[PDB]
Amino acid sequence: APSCPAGSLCTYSGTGLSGARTVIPASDMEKAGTDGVKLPASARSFANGTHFTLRYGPARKVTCVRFPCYQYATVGKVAPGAQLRSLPSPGATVTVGQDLGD
C-alpha cells in the first residue's frame, strides 16, 4: 500500500510510514544494493525519495541458498517509483529488486 510520504526510501510496518518505520535516503540501500528479494507491502511499504530501480514480478523463489534470493524472475522493472522517482511505493506479495544507488 502506497501510504508512505516522500523524500527517501522510508520503509515501515504500519501503512503511512508508521509501525516499524525506517528511512533509506538512497544510502542504506547501497548497503543492501537492489534489495534483491521479495519486497512485500502489507505493513511494509515506503516513500521513494529516488528512482529505487524496482525490478519486480510475482514472488516464487522461497528455496534460497541462504537469504540472498531475488524471490522471483523479473517481470518488468519500474525504476522511478513506477512513474515518478518521489512517492509512496507499493508492492503486495510481489518480489522486488529494490535498488537505491546500490
Swiss-Prot record:
Keywords: Disulfide bond, Metalloenzyme inhibitor, Metalloprotease inhibitor, Protease inhibitor, Signal. It comes from the Bacteria. Disulfide bonds join 4-10, 64-69. One of its GO terms (molecular function) is peptidase inhibitor activity. Thermolysin slowly cleaves only the peptide bond following Cys-64. Inhibits microbial metallo-proteinases, such as thermolysin, but not serine, thiol, or carboxyl proteinases. This is Metalloproteinase inhibitor. It comes from Streptomyces nigrescens. The lineage of its organism: Bacteria, Bacillati, Actinomycetota, Actinomycetes, Kitasatosporales. The chain holds residues 30 to 131 of 131 of the full protein.
